[PDB]
Design a protein around this ligand. Structure first.
Ligand SMILES: [Cl-]
Ligand SMILES: [Cl-]
Ligand SMILES: [Cl-]
Ligand SMILES: [Cl-]
Ligand SMILES: [Cl-]
Ligand SMILES: [Cl-]
Ligand SMILES: [Cl-]
Ligand SMILES: [Cl-]
Ligand SMILES: [Cl-]
Ligand SMILES: [Cl-]
Ligand SMILES: [Cl-]
Ligand SMILES: [Cl-]
Ligand SMILES: [Cl-]
Ligand SMILES: [Cl-]
Ligand SMILES: [Cl-]
Ligand SMILES: [Cl-]
Ligand SMILES: [Cl-]
Ligand SMILES: [Cl-]
Ligand SMILES: [Cl-]
Ligand SMILES: [Cl-]
Ligand SMILES: [Cl-]
Ligand SMILES: [Cl-]
Ligand SMILES: [Cl-]
Ligand SMILES: [Cl-]
Ligand SMILES: [Cl-]
Ligand SMILES: [Cl-]
Ligand SMILES: [Cl-]
Ligand SMILES: [Cl-]
Ligand SMILES: [Cl-]
Ligand SMILES: [Cl-]
Ligand SMILES: [Cl-]
Ligand SMILES: [Cl-]
Ligand SMILES: [Cl-]
Ligand SMILES: [Cl-]
Ligand SMILES: [Cl-]
Ligand SMILES: [Cl-]
Ligand SMILES: [Cl-]
Ligand SMILES: [Cl-]
Ligand SMILES: [Cl-]
Ligand SMILES: [Cl-]
Ligand SMILES: [Cl-]
Ligand SMILES: [Cl-]
Ligand SMILES: [Cl-]
Ligand SMILES: [Cl-]
Ligand SMILES: [Zn+2]
Ligand SMILES: [Zn+2]
Lengths: 208, 208, 208, 208, 208, 208
């Protein structure tokens, strides 16, 4: 069996837009992806609410710096055949600059980490699939939750695409199959979450 | 005798908008609060210039992360009957996002820290009073010192009020009794600082 | 299905004593434990080489502080029914003091973290099983690898037992079913590793 | 009126040897010192259980690095006439080397911090009194709690005295006043604690 | 012979605007400055791509916090006759607030660090030259690389000049010598870089 | 012209065992090495008092973690043909374990960092020379300064030699040409320091 790290934020954890509680496992994208691959791959879910690509954020009960946690994830789960990273939604929070630039820079740093990590064995370098999260939409007040800007979130797909092409990795736009909930303008309902896991099965087969 | 922690930033330290030097003790809000309580409470002042709710900031001579310092203050001064926190003014600096969202997320974290800290004895869980600082005002340039946004500072009161209600803690708006000085748009003169100490006496007495 | 976090160091990752490469998944204690529970529970493996209970160690490619990583693990995998922690082998390295005291202190800190974490939902507080790792034995040179002391490693079982009794959690001594390899005096061969996963099924059933 | 910072660990917080609960205020050394000074001085207590001179220690609920917390305490309480530091008891724990060298090196760093801090106003440089804590004694089992070495704890007085003379600051040996409790070999009962505050009045009065 | 520390970011390292590769040594400003000083001084280059004044930034392969690295550079190269700091270009990135206030606050902190550092010998306090980097210009797409704001970059000169006068140090506007390259709006070509080193000789000669 | 990084601690800075002040430039090993190479190499000295291989140590005025600083040195001075590292003397302080194991684990990490760093251009991967510092000697008390163990310092050469051979890098034992001074048991006098610079010329020439 191939092994896959599914690395992300609360969209990967599976936060309900209304309650903030976790979606049933049957609807979480990493579990869905694994079920879709039907015994080919084992998917290790590592979705942390508030996680950024590479920016400290102490507003939660656990460390939100994606790069530090990615290193731990790589060590815990190596050897890995594929790493999938869906991040950027928190990098466009005002505290982290409010713009897509910080998300693409951080994603480039995570790619370099995956590429150059000291794996056991050294030859076990995983492939990488960079996933753009679905863009934000108008929340109830007319804007997305957390002061995020819609137009900046919409820049993540083309910037991540261009980054993946530069670095020689794969890209998928989760916004092409799923939309943010209008309950908060940011998070995904169960249906949209499961549609991401289903949609990722195809590229994950091309890659593996 | 009740014990109270007064945890804040230079508004709590008592920074003179003019000199940047410290207000005399008689005009600092923690001391004024203690004097107004006429011997019923001991108030421990912990006001640090530049302190944020939960964001690292290395531009001063001392750690500005409110969450880390709060844990230290809770341990040094426990058992505490009440924690009063007045923070947010630095969270709206441009480097921390320039917006109120970061402040309220950080205040939620500080509230969680107060609730769940490992106290000696464990049952000594303090009550919590969340205080919105007075908003910034048009400074001598037409803008508050440090690039802070007046509009964003004015969102702290309503967002903190909702937060306090959600978590079942207490709220007071210091802007209801005091305004920032036009000298720099941010800090409080001696009578505005004393005004907060006096106004906090009523709710603190009710809470204790 | 119940959910279980399996939190540890390279003994939990499954390092081969000779090569340092990972044991086949069939022999890793978290996978074995899950297979033994036969659909009752899902076990999330989080075994990181070099991990300590609560001590920084920058000698590896990823963060080794168990407490910081435990917080991330709890957020990624909550709601959890049970956390199992097998740590201490690295806490008795000379750099961390060379003695069992540091391991028991750190384990107490991890227990407090599990108890008091801000879970979604708040009511989802997991049970805890504290696992003492098998003691070190004479490596090739007459002593265990890494300057570890045999007699100190042998203190982990009784100290962890007493800690678990104090805190009202469960305890298992992995040394009662598995022995360190003489190849390095510290790590576990595949057989000893799998015997730990098999042996844990019983207490894990009593607990769940 | 003069202001004094009383910076230490659980000996300064006032941990009861038997229970770990805080001594009553009238038996804590900072409070006793203030009462003896009879209105010459206000003393700000900053005693944190587990605090080291300058060493990270994550086994507690709050940061134990004395240097980082000292910077915070200076900023919160400046302008200060005098800083009193009683630390070293935790630096001789095995995790921090088990020896007195680390305590004296750390005290040097703390003295440097007090000397060179960016005070408001810049010329308000406090005087410094370096205090050797009372040496450990045999606890119930025959040695002090926490793996501490009696012989090493007895070196702090001579080493701190030489350090104080070298840097041109003041020294006081709290061990020449009171002794550690045999209840755990490390902490101070309420009358030993009060004795230290009383004995401190005279030299503090002279320094001020 | 005098010694000089040249502390900066990729403008000091010498990043070519088109390729990102290092300019040849004879076109790097520190080397050019040393050649012009004609044996009066040795200049130690410490230019790190991405370096901010005092802000953590984890998007690169090395620490970008200027304050922490400045302490290291002072210790490595002390005793120093003069410190030259050219920073600010990264502090105006959106992730760090997008504005000049953070650069000037950070420069103040760096100046404080140089003034108050524990030098060997203690009296070897270096002089300080604060350098405003050349302002950003429109890149190919119409604005500078990295989301930087031209208007904000133009504030560094007046703000640094006022800061330098306030603290009693020297100021030099590198922007009054050379301009950012329109290849990316931010970095300096080899002849602009050399021009800054040449222009620095005269004031450095006078300061020394 | 080749470029060489000379990365170390106060032995590399050139600490006078007597005064603690810096050796004249003519007697520092990096400068002596550069002079011996008679214009064929540029040697960048980066020696920091108290530096460890990879362990935080807050007892000085600057960060002592060798790994973090190495990343900074690699970025500031790349492209580099060769990195020379002489570290270990501080890793054997009691606070870091008092033993050679920590030093060799940290040297492995530093070697990994040199190998895998994101260089500009990526193909500019330096060669590596690992240098064992001269062992500690009986100081004026009969023991080396700082509680260091002579026996443990003597293990650095054989452990580093094996490490270098395993990783396919170069090794030199500075103890083969120099001894620590009996003045403090730890530091090197001016002729011992120069002796290392001269002896390193042969292998450095062969490596380049
Ligand atoms: Cl950050
Ligand atoms: Cl974080
Ligand atoms: Cl795994
Ligand atoms: Cl935000
Ligand atoms: Cl790939
Ligand atoms: Cl595109
Ligand atoms: Cl494809
Ligand atoms: Cl006050
Ligand atoms: Cl932060
Ligand atoms: Cl901070
Ligand atoms: Cl108190
Ligand atoms: Cl409350
Ligand atoms: Cl206004
Ligand atoms: Cl630690
Ligand atoms: Cl760590
Ligand atoms: Cl999970
Ligand atoms: Cl070790
Ligand atoms: Cl339990
Ligand atoms: Cl027992
Ligand atoms: Cl049982
Ligand atoms: Cl007290
Ligand atoms: Cl430390
Ligand atoms: Cl700490
Ligand atoms: Cl105060
Ligand atoms: Cl310990
Ligand atoms: Cl030490
Ligand atoms: Cl010392
Ligand atoms: Cl003094
Ligand atoms: Cl005085
Ligand atoms: Cl240069
Ligand atoms: Cl920061
Ligand atoms: Cl950084
Ligand atoms: Cl130098
Ligand atoms: Cl940015
Ligand atoms: Cl700012
Ligand atoms: Cl400023
Ligand atoms: Cl100057
Ligand atoms: Cl000069
Ligand atoms: Cl040199
Ligand atoms: Cl460390
Ligand atoms: Cl450090
Ligand atoms: Cl260079
Ligand atoms: Cl090599
Ligand atoms: Cl000897
Ligand atoms: Zn493909
Ligand atoms: Zn049971």
């Amino acid at each position: 069996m191939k092994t896959v790290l599914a690395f992300g934020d609360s969209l990967t954890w599976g936060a309900d837009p209304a309650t903030g509680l976790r979606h049933p496992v049957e609807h979480r994208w990493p579990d869905v992806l694994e079920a879709e691959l039907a015994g080919k791959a084992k998917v290790h879910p590592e979705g942390l609410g508030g996680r950024t690509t590479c920016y400290d954020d102490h507003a939660g009960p656990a460390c939100r710096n994606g790069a530090r946690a990615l290193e731990v994830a790589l060590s815990c789960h190596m050897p890995l055949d594929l790493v999938i990273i869906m991040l950027g939604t928190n990098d466009i929070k005002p505290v982290h600059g409010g713009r897509a630039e910080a998300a693409v820079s951080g994603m480039r740093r995570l790619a370099q980490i995956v590429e150059t990590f000291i794996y056991k064995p050294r030859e076990a370098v995983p492939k990488l699939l960079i996933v753009a999260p679905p863009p934000c939409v108008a929340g109830p007040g007319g804007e997305p939750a957390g002061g995020r800007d819609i137009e900046q979130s919409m820049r993540l797909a083309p910037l991540y695409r261009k980054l993946a092409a530069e670095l020689g990795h794969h890209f998928f736009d989760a916004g092409s199959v799923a939309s943010a909930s209008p309950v908060d303008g940011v998070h995904l309902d169960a249906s949209a979450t499961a549609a991401i896991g289903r949609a990722l099965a195809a590229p994950v087969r091309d890659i593996l």
